[PDB]
Design an enzyme around this catalytic site. Structure first.
Site, PDB file in Angstrom:
ATOM      1  N   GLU A 177       0.827  -1.208   0.000  1.00  0.00           N
ATOM      2  CA  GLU A 177       0.000   0.000   0.000  1.00  0.00           C
ATOM      3  C   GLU A 177       0.863   1.260   0.000  1.00  0.00           C
ATOM      4  O   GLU A 177       0.632   2.203   0.759  1.00  0.00           O
ATOM      5  CB  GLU A 177      -0.974   0.000   1.180  1.00  0.00           C
TER       6      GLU A 177
ATOM      7  N   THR B 290       0.951   2.368  -9.174  1.00  0.00           N
ATOM      8  CA  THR B 290       0.519   3.636  -9.752  1.00  0.00           C
ATOM      9  C   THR B 290       1.539   4.159 -10.752  1.00  0.00           C
ATOM     10  O   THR B 290       1.172   4.671 -11.817  1.00  0.00           O
ATOM     11  CB  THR B 290       0.275   4.664  -8.650  1.00  0.00           C
ATOM     12  OG1 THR B 290      -0.814   4.233  -7.831  1.00  0.00           O
ATOM     13  CG2 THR B 290      -0.063   6.017  -9.243  1.00  0.00           C
TER      14      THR B 290
ATOM     15  N   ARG C 199      -7.929   0.957  -6.603  1.00  0.00           N
ATOM     16  CA  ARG C 199      -7.031   0.016  -5.941  1.00  0.00           C
ATOM     17  C   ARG C 199      -7.474  -1.399  -6.288  1.00  0.00           C
ATOM     18  O   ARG C 199      -8.574  -1.819  -5.915  1.00  0.00           O
ATOM     19  CB  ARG C 199      -7.024   0.234  -4.429  1.00  0.00           C
ATOM     20  CG  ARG C 199      -6.436  -0.921  -3.639  1.00  0.00           C
ATOM     21  CD  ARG C 199      -4.947  -1.060  -3.899  1.00  0.00           C
ATOM     22  NE  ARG C 199      -4.379  -2.222  -3.228  1.00  0.00           N
ATOM     23  CZ  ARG C 199      -4.043  -2.254  -1.946  1.00  0.00           C
ATOM     24  NH1 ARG C 199      -4.212  -1.204  -1.161  1.00  0.00           N
ATOM     25  NH2 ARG C 199      -3.525  -3.369  -1.439  1.00  0.00           N
TER      26      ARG C 199
ATOM     27  N   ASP D 135       6.898  -4.814 -12.026  1.00  0.00           N
ATOM     28  CA  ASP D 135       6.631  -4.958 -10.604  1.00  0.00           C
ATOM     29  C   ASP D 135       6.930  -6.394 -10.178  1.00  0.00           C
ATOM     30  O   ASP D 135       7.395  -7.220 -10.967  1.00  0.00           O
ATOM     31  CB  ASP D 135       5.183  -4.572 -10.305  1.00  0.00           C
ATOM     32  CG  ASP D 135       4.941  -4.278  -8.837  1.00  0.00           C
ATOM     33  OD1 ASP D 135       5.517  -4.978  -7.980  1.00  0.00           O
ATOM     34  OD2 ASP D 135       4.165  -3.349  -8.537  1.00  0.00           O
TER      35      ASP D 135
ATOM     36  N   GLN E  73       3.422 -11.262  -2.785  1.00  0.00           N
ATOM     37  CA  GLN E  73       2.869 -11.276  -1.435  1.00  0.00           C
ATOM     38  C   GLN E  73       4.011 -10.953  -0.482  1.00  0.00           C
ATOM     39  O   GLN E  73       5.185 -11.108  -0.828  1.00  0.00           O
ATOM     40  CB  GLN E  73       2.233 -12.630  -1.084  1.00  0.00           C
ATOM     41  CG  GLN E  73       1.450 -12.653   0.223  1.00  0.00           C
ATOM     42  CD  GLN E  73       0.305 -11.659   0.238  1.00  0.00           C
ATOM     43  OE1 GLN E  73      -0.279 -11.349  -0.800  1.00  0.00           O
ATOM     44  NE2 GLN E  73      -0.022 -11.153   1.421  1.00  0.00           N
TER      45      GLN E  73
END
Ligand SMILES: Nc1nc2c(ncn2[C@@H]2O[C@H](COP(=O)(O)OP(=O)(O)OP(=O)(O)O)[C@@H](O)[C@H]2O)c(=O)[nH]1
Ligand SMILES: CN[C@@H]1CCc2c(ccc(O)c2O)[C@H]1O
Ligand SMILES: [Mg+2]
Lengths: 338, 359, 56, 224
Positions: free
Chosen positions: B39, B44, B169, B191, B195
């Site tokens: 988060e 983005t 999101r 990316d 997890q």
């Protein structure tokens, strides 16, 4: 409550350890101290295969011990011809991150895994002489770590989500599911009769699953660090393990105990892959110190040293007939020894 | 028969020609890796970089905006009974039970009945009082923006804009990768977003990337990790940065540092409430460094807070081939990212790498 | 929830303990016997002739 | 017998150059191969010269061949260093850049410009030589001297200055001076005095050439 239950769990672990002590009659070295040493073993690079652009992560031999498949970090599978060093295919990939590869026993399918959580499967012999993705298996979470073939319609995988599953290509669904590990699963190996298989977890433990029933049989925890590779003895009643520390051990099924330890005081690096030979007399083992080593299954002494990659050894394998030994590396090179 | 040998040699020649042709592209690409805590704003940047340099960047999308709106309103109202101090408000009393009833259901309340009375709860004075202290409970960062936009989404033919798409999101499972081109040269950024894992055994695969981009939230210094009561949300990032920096495999990889959510930090300091000194006790003795270059619109009070965060991150890097590049960013502002990357590229990592033989 | 997790772990561990085992001496003897029988058919230990070697 | 020591000393120049050649890989490393190959040919050229001072000129037509080979080797080495300096500086100055044929171009320029006339044969003292002293009048030297030393030094002085300036600015956002001095001072001190001596148009000028042949040999270690 949990306190009462936790007492019961501790009340059973001591029974396992106590019972194992009674089974120990003599060490392996005592029963095998009266055999002639094999002697020095020396063998040179018969062939060198080049053409990859990045590091090789895995390889697998064909059933006929003539064709092999390798996977690289630039997303390319290429099938070599060992005898004449001739490429046969060059398959591009959807994702550039690949960790595994496989070759079906019938020589009609080639499966590659990867960090994209997809165990995509390819087809080799078909119409128009082209290779296309046959099926994509996507019911699984975490990056994959190995892939194996039982037959033309069954494939076993293992990922970093503490899970191992047995798939089914035609239906494209998980037939069974194995659970119980407390860490990532790094490698697995099928038994010679394709009835049992093991898996080296990341919490310094190894299990022994059953394909049909789907339950854990035993558990060996003699290590003290990560586990990176596992292979079976050709007999099918023992398997060797290569851990993160320099030690490589050898467990037994019926005796349910660790037997011998392979280590030296001058080695402090890791272990990447292990493999036996046709007669189960030698235990080849890759290392992280830019070369390889050859141990002995009984005397537990280093016989010969294989060097020349100039970068870490990332994969290893031995042909079915025991005629050649192939190794990969991180410098885009493959070699054949004899 | 020699025909088989000739055919095999011809196939080998064709494959070699294709490989030689393909070798040129691989050597001319730069690969970048994103990192950071959860988060924080990693995805983005990837979505924005598509819009900046690629033309291509919707009905299924409109579902998740509605999903985001439902989750935010349910959390604020339902969490009040859990706060120890009572700030209890009788409006929409028959609706509070309705929200609790629909708080758990696989199918959303697509009917327009839910939207009508949900506006009143947002306009209710009690909810705004509950929203004023959002540190205690976990809330989505895009709650205020979407809640005020409840009128636009109600009407049919929503056709959400690009700006509204940026603040959505959605969790990511696999590798989130993109491929764009800057003038002649081309780039490749991916990316990981798998997890949270303490071991991160896959870090070995990234041993040849040109640079590693680190993204850390700067406006979250009074919140906890998803695992409740774990630690300060900023302290969890500092521990992660030290582990990545002092790693065996990443021994010659530069790091680009981004500090997002600058606008959120600016608003928090202005309107009093929680102070930094309460959470970080060493900030009380801080003095602004002489070599300071404040933005023209920045008030003097907030410029002292910006550099305290930068100093904490920079101290770890400078304690121990390696280099660290600090930056200040706001990922939502489209024009903002278009300048930092360029300026950061100016002082090329490559010139430094070539300059290694003699400076 | 978790207590069940501890309940499931102890249930699995009980069946593992009730297993048959054999002595190491009667187990280590078999491995030594296996290697001696298949020693001849191993082209890695005893070098193969150049004529029989397919790689040269 | 000091000549035997000096001749044996310069025989050691072939040792290091060969070892660099034996190691033999990148885009820039291909260019660096040219300089090493030409220098090893130097040992064959130097041995006839050393013996001649000791005293020969057994070959009536072979006397000019040695001069042609020496001129070709010198101009090839100078052009090779100019090319490598230009390549490195252009690559460093402009980031995000977008070989065998080129090395061939400089070699073609040298072999031709430095050998054609000496074989071709393009005053009273020269007539005596015809009956291994080197006597050029006619400003052949002006073309060879200009196209083999000043044109190469003029290119090297500019590219290196821009590269050092770009190095001094990046620290602002030492070892550089030491490395640039090691690169430039050796070449300047070993070749510029000879160029000054040649343009004056004899023991001194022969002596300057004798002093300078080794500098191309020392070149393998500094570049390596
Ligand atoms: N106001 C504001 N919101 C931001 C800013 N940067 C990001 N956000 C929002 O904060 C959230 C950031 O989370 P994501 O965009 O999913 O990125 P992430 O959390 O790194 O993604 P994962 O960790 O992979 O799940 C999103 O709702 C963004 O729209 C910023 O500068 N200002
Ligand atoms: C010492 N032997 C020769 C003499 C003249 C000469 C040389 C090199 C380059 C030239 O342009 C020359 O005119 C020397 O190598
Ligand atoms: Mg994501």
């Amino acid at each position: 409550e949990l306190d009462q239950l936790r007492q019961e769990a501790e009340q059973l672990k001591n029974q396992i350890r106590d019972a194992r002590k009674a089974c120990a009659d003599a060490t392996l070295s005592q029963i095998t101290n009266n055999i002639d040493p094999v002697g020095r073993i020396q063998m040179r690079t018969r062939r060198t295969l080049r053409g990859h652009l990045a590091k090789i992560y895995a390889m697998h031999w064909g059933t006929d011990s003539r064709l092999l498949v390798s996977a690289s970090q630039d997303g390319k599978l290429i099938i070599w011809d060992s005898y004449t060093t001739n490429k046969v295919h060059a398959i591009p990939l959807r994702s550039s991150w690949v960790m595994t590869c496989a070759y079906a026993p019938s020589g009609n399918y080639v499966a590659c895994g990867g960090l994209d959580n997809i165990c995509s499967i390819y087809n080799l012999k078909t119409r128009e002489g082209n290779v296309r993705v046959s099926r994509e298996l996507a019911g699984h979470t975490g990056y994959l770590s190995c892939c194996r073939f039982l037959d033309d319609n069954q494939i076993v995988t293992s990922s970093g989500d503490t899970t191992c599953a047995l798939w089914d290509i035609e239906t494209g669904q998980q037939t069974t599911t194995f659970t119980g590990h407390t860490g990532d699963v790094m490698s697995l190996s099928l038994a010679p009769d394709t009835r049992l298989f093991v898996s080296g977890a990341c919490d310094a433990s190894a299990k022994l699953w059953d394909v049909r029933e789907g339950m854990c049989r035993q558990t060996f925890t003699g290590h003290e660090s990560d586990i990176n590779a596992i292979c079976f003895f050709p007999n099918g009643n023992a398997f060797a393990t290569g851990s993160d520390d320099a030690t490589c051990r050898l467990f037994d099924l019926r005796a349910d105990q660790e037997l011998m330890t392979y280590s030296h005081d001058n080695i402090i690096c890791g272990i990447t892959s292990v493999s036996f030979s046709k007669s189960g007399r030698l235990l080849l083992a890759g290392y992280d110190d830019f070369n390889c080593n050859v141990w002995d299954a009984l005397k537990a002494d280093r016989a010969g040293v294989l060097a020349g990659h100039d970068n870490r050894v990332s994969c290893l394998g031995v042909t079915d007939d025991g005629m050649a030994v192939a190794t990969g590396s991180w410098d885009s090179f493959l070699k054949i020894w004899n | 028969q020699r025909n088989e040998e000739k055919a095999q040699r011809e196939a080998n020649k064709k494959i070699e020609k294709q490989l030689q042709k393909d070798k040129q592209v691989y050597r001319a690409t730069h690969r970048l890796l994103l990192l950071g805590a959860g988060e924080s704003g990693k995805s983005t940047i990837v979505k924005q970089m598509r819009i900046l340099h690629v033309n291509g960047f919707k009905a299924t999308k409109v579902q998740d905006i509605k999903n985001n709106l439902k989750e935010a309103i349910e959390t604020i109202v339902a969490a009040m009974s859990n706060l120890v101090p009572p700030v209890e408000l009788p409006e929409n009393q028959f609706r509070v039970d309705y929200i609790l009833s629909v708080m758990n259901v696989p199918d959303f309340d697509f009917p327009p009945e839910f939207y009508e009375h949900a506006k009143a709860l947002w306009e209710d004075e009690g909810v705004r009082a509950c929203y004023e202290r959002s540190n205690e409970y976990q809330l989505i960062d895009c709650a205020q923006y979407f809640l005020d936009k409840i009128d636009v989404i109600k009407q049919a033919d929503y056709v959400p804009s690009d700006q509204d798409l940026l603040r959505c999101r959605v969790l990511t499972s696999g590798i989130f990768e993109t491929k764009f081109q800057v003038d002649k040269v081309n780039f490749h950024m991916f990316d990981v977003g798998g997890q949270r894992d303490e071991r991160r055994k896959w870090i070995q695969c990234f041993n040849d990337v040109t640079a590693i981009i680190f993204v850390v939230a700067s406006s979250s210094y009074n919140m906890v990790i998803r695992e409740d009561n774990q630690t300060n949300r900023l302290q969890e990032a500092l521990n992660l940065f030290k582990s990545i920096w002092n790693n065996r495999w990443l021994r010659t990889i530069s790091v680009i540092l981004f500090l997002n959510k600058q606008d959120l930090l600016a608003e928090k300091v202005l309107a009093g409430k929680s102070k930094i000194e309460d959470y970080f006790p060493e900030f009380a003795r801080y003095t602004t460094p002489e070599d300071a270059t404040p933005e023209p619109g920045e008030d003097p009070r907030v410029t002292r807070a910006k550099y305290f965060i930068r100093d904490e991150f920079l101290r770890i890097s400078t304690a121990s081939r390696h280099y660290c590049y600090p930056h200040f960013t706001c990922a939502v502002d489209t024009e903002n990212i278009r300048r930092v990357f360029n300026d950061c590229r100016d002082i090329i990592q490559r010139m430094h790498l070539r300059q290694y033989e003699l400076l | 929830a978790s207590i069940a997790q501890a309940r499931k772990l102890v249930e699995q561990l009980k069946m593992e303990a009730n297993i048959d085992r054999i002595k190491v001496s009667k187990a280590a003897a078999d491995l030594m016997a296996y290697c001696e029988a298949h020693a001849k058919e191993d082209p890695l230990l005893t070098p193969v002739p150049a004529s029989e070697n397919p790689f040269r | 017998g000091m000549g035997i020591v000096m001749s044996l000393i310069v025989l050691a120049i072939v040792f290091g150059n060969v070892l660099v050649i034996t190691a033999i890989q990148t885009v820039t490393n291909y260019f660096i191969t040219s300089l090493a190959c030409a220098d090893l040919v130097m040992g064959l050229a130097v041995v006839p010269f050393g013996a001649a001072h000791i005293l020969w000129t057994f070959g009536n037509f072979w006397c000019e061949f040695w001069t042609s080979i020496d001129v070709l080797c010198v101009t090839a080495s100078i052009e090779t260093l100019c090319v490598i300096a230009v390549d490195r500086y252009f690559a460093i100055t402009s980031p995000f850049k977008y070989a065998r044929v080129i090395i061939l171009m400089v070699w073609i320029v040298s072999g031709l410009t430095s050998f054609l006339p000496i074989q071709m044969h393009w005053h009273q003292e020269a007539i005596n030589c015809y009956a291994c002293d080197f006597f050029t009048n006619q400003a052949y030297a002006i073309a060879s001297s200009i196209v083999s030393f000043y044109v190469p030094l003029v290119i090297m002085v500019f590219v290196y200055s821009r590269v050092f300036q770009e190095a001094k600015r990046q620290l602002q956002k030492h070892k550089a001076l030491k490395t640039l001095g090691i690169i430039m001072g050796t070449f300047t001190l070993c070749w510029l005095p000879f160029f000054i001596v040649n343009i004056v148009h004899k023991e001194v000028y022969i002596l300057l050439n004798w002093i300078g042949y080794v500098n191309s040999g020392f070149n393998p270690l500094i570049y390596c």
